[PDB]
Each structure stands twice: as structure tokens, then as C-alpha cells.
Design a binder for this molecule. Structure first.
Ligand SMILES: Nc1ncnc2c1ncn2[C@@H]1O[C@H](CO)[C@@H](OC(=O)[C@@H](N)Cc2ccccc2)[C@H]1O
Ligand SMILES: Nc1ncnc2c1ncn2[C@@H]1O[C@H](CO)[C@@H](OC(=O)[C@@H](N)Cc2ccccc2)[C@H]1O
Lengths: 231, 231
């Protein structure tokens, strides 16, 4: 029952109508305007499409997700992290992180210049945030996403140095949990997310979770740029 | 006799010693740091000055105020709001609302890059909030201010489409009242504000209200970003 968004309205169809195959494809067209996106993440919808294609909106079923508590950290990583060679900051360099994500010529191929601006825009308005991983003064990895109350919608992550990506995710989760963070939406499950504790749950439930958590809150300063981890 | 603020501390002089004409002129100098700004609102003072001049602080007598309940709404406006073409949201795009007021070419000329950054910190820190009015996908109005308990200090409004500004206030007041909102600071009274039902109580009366409402509280999640009204 695919819907064709217009320049006019900013309203999305109901997730229930999403197609089974491809999984969750709900609507195409529209723009990546703050109001539109912010409206979409609020309803459990998210944009994803390959360069050259029109904007595609999804709300897959089942929905991959990560319980902060359940993050799985190997014994080796913990040893590594006990004596971590990195530093971790919050919203210190959103632009660089989303850039490194597009860099990786794979999962980040969809992150096009326009995609980068739409999200940078959210970060600038206080909704899209990033976790940066440093080695010296160099940014070696990180991750960004869109906060939805006590729920965090992961957008992507990148790594240019062994375990940088896990450090960011690791430390994020700790800060997140210690302050009220309830969930992490991973959208679609994959080997990486799976090897981390991401698990599927019915769309029907993710929407319940979403509706509840989007009205919750963390300390005011929680998303204020700062240092999260440093030896 | 007209105190100069010192960078050393965040202390302000009694408002009762403000000038009688220019009405409210109390002190100049200081800075626009969170600590200071918050202290000003805490004690019934607010900064205002045109580009070029030093920081000027005020606390006029009388003070313009708006009883959330006594908001005057014409019959054509209700007629219009019933079939409203706008969408109202809270703290979705503080940055843009403030820039919108800051560019209303007439009054918002005092809102400089400096002032914007200053209030943006308070928003980032969670004391400043904004009400956006959307027409489809575009921002056509809004309003921002500083939350002082059950009291709310209005800083500015801006409109790009008929009745946008009024919708913002309308929707706000309803919500505001709904959860314990008690008063809306209007700083100085003017034609528009007065047509909306704002009045004037003595500086000392307003100051009392300030103390009572400062401690007064609203639901813990009152300001979290969210839609307040769908067309
Ligand atoms: N098809 C697709 N849709 C969205 N995001 C995608 C896609 N393909 C790759 N990505 C991004 O690349 C990373 C690779 O790890 C993906 O990570 C995820 O599984 C995210 N959907 C959720 C998440 C992001 C950051 C941190 C934790 C979870 C994805 O972001
Ligand atoms: N001197 C002065 N101080 C503040 N704001 C001023 C001033 N002169 C003009 N303005 C702006 O013009 C509008 C006129 O309606 C003012 O709006 C206000 O009522 C604000 N002062 C307070 C307020 C903000 C939002 C919602 C309700 C009240 C102001 O923007």
C-alpha cells in the first residue's frame, strides 16, 4: 500500500501497512527536512536508500534492537578496555563521525552528502548525537544516532582502529544505562549487531516501547558535549 | 548609582533600585553566561540592548504579564484553529525559532550572534525552551523563553504565516495550564501582547509571584521534545 509522500503534507502512513518484502518498505519521496525526519523517528519510521534512488522510508518487522544491559562484551575486549588506549567524547565532532561512517565503502554508501546534511541538521537542533573515539588527537572511530527519549536510534558506526567501534558502543551503553537509557534501536539485525546482543522483537512491540520511551528523559546535561571516558 | 556588573561574581542589585525612565534600567556590564542569565531570571531581571552597546539589564515597573487563562482569542481565531492548518511542537527546533525572532527585522534586532549563543546554552542546559508552529514541512512561526518553575518568561515570538504566532501561544497556554502553569512573563507590554490579554501588575507584585512559582513545579517531563497539536 506504498505511499508517495509529497512536498505538501509531512504525515506518514501507519507502520502496519509496511510491506513484508522488502521488509518494512513503507513510503518513498518527500524530503529529509528536520520536521519530516523528526516526525518519522517519532512514529518508528526511518529513511534508507541507495544513492540515485528516491528517499525510501522503512519500519521493518521484526525490528532489531539492543537492550543496553545485554550488550555482550568478550573477555578479551574487557582486558583491552581495562587498559584502553582510547578516550571517548560525546557530541564533540558529529560531522567527523558521520563522515567516517560514509567513508567505509560499504554500509555507509547510503550516507550521501544530502543525508549528511539532514542529520547534521538534527545534531544542530539537539536530536542526532555522536560518540567519538580518540587515539591521541586522532579520531579513530565512533557512532551516531537519533535520541528518542530513553530510546536511542542507532544510525551507524565506523572504525579505523581495532576495537574503536566497540569502545564507543561499550562506554555509551554504560553512560546510557547509568542515566535512564532504556533501549537502542538497531533497525535491522546483522552479524555485527547480533554478535553484540542485538535481538529481534515484533514491530508491534517496538512501537509500544517507542511510544513510552520517547516521552522519558535523561539529565539535561546528558547530551551536552563532553568527555565520557578517559584513562 | 547604576551598578556595573563584575565578571568576578554572578551577583545582581535589588530590582527596586532600577531607574524610573528608561523604565527598569538597572545595570550594565557582566556577561551572558548561564550562571548569570539564570541568576537574572531568578531575581526578576533580564538583559536587553542594541548591537554595539554594552550588556544592559532590566527589571521594569510595572511588569507586563499574561495569566495563561485570561488569554484573549477572537472568534475568527477559534473558527480558524478548529480547522487549523498548523502543527505545534515543543523544543523541536529551538535554534530556528530564536533565529526567526532574531530576524523579524524590527524588534529582534537586539538578538545578536552573541545573544543567540547565550540562550542556546540555556536551552542546551534545559532552562530555555521553544514552541514551533509548522505549516506542512515549513517553520512558519514560534516562540521561546526561560522556564522559571510554574512561571514562564517569554522572550519573543515571530510569524511568517497568518495566525502562526497566535497558534503557538494558544496551544502553549492550554498545555501550560493543563499541568500547573501559573503565569507568563511578558517583560514589557505592547499592542500585540495587550490585544492577547496581557496586563500589568506592579514590579513588587511580579517579584512575589516569581518567588512562589520558582519553586513551583511541573511534570518532570513537561519540556521533553514533542508534538503538541496535529492539524
Ligand atoms: N540498510 C541499512 N539501513 C540502515 N543503516 C545501515 C544499513 N546498512 C548499514 N547501515 C549502518 O551501518 C552500520 C554497520 O554497523 C549499521 O549499524 C546498525 O545495525 C544500525 N542500523 C543500528 C546501530 C547503529 C549504531 C550503533 C548501534 C546500532 C547501520 O548503522
Ligand atoms: N522590549 C522588548 N522586550 C522583549 N520583547 C520585545 C520587546 N520589544 C518587542 N519585543 C518582541 O515583540 C513581540 C511583540 O508581541 C514581543 O513578544 C512578547 O510578548 C515577548 N516580549 C514575551 C513573550 C514571548 C513569547 C510569548 C509570549 C510573550 C517580543 O518578541
Amino acid at each position: 500500500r506504498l505511499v508517495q509522500l509529497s512536498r505538501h503534507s509531512i504525515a506518514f502512513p501507519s507502520p502496519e501497512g509496511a510491506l513484508r518484502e522488502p521488509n518494512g518498505l513503507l513510503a518513498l519521496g518527500g524530503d529529509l527536512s528536520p520536521a519530516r525526519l523528526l516526525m518519522a523517528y517519532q512514529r518508528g519510521i526511518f529513511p534508507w536508500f541507495s544513492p540515485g534512488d528516491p528517499i525510501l522510508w522503512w519500519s521493518p518487522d521484526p525490528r532489531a534492537v539492543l537492550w543496553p544491559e545485554s550488550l555482550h562484551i568478550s573477555r578479551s575486549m574487557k582486558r583491552f578496555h581495562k587498559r584502553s588506549p582510547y578516550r571517548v567524547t560525546m557530541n564533540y565532532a558529529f560531522g567527523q563521525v558521520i563522515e567516517g561512517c560514509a567513508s567505509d565503502r560499504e554500509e555507509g554508501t547510503w550516507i550521501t552528502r544530502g543525508v549528511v546534511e539532514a542529520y547534521h541538521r538534527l545534531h544542530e537542533l539537539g536530536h542526532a548525537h555522536s560518540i567519538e573515539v580518540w587515539r591521541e588527537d586522532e579520531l579513530v572511530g565512533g557512532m551516531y544516532g537519533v535520541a528518542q527519549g530513553t530510546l536511542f536510534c542507532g544510525e551507524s558506526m565506523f572504525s579505523r582502529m581495532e576495537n574503536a567501534s566497540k569502545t564507543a558502543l561499550l562506554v555509551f551503553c554504560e553512560e546510557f544505562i547509568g542515566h535512564g537509557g532504556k533501549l537502542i534501536d538497531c533497525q535491522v539485525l546483522n552479524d555485527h549487531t547480533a554478535s553484540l546482543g542485538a535481538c529481534e522483537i515484533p514491530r508491534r512491540d517496538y512501537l509500544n516501547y517507542l511510544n513510552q520511551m520517547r516521552l522519558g528523559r535523561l539529565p539535561n546535561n546528558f547530551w551536552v558535549p563532553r568527555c565520557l571516558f578517559s584513562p
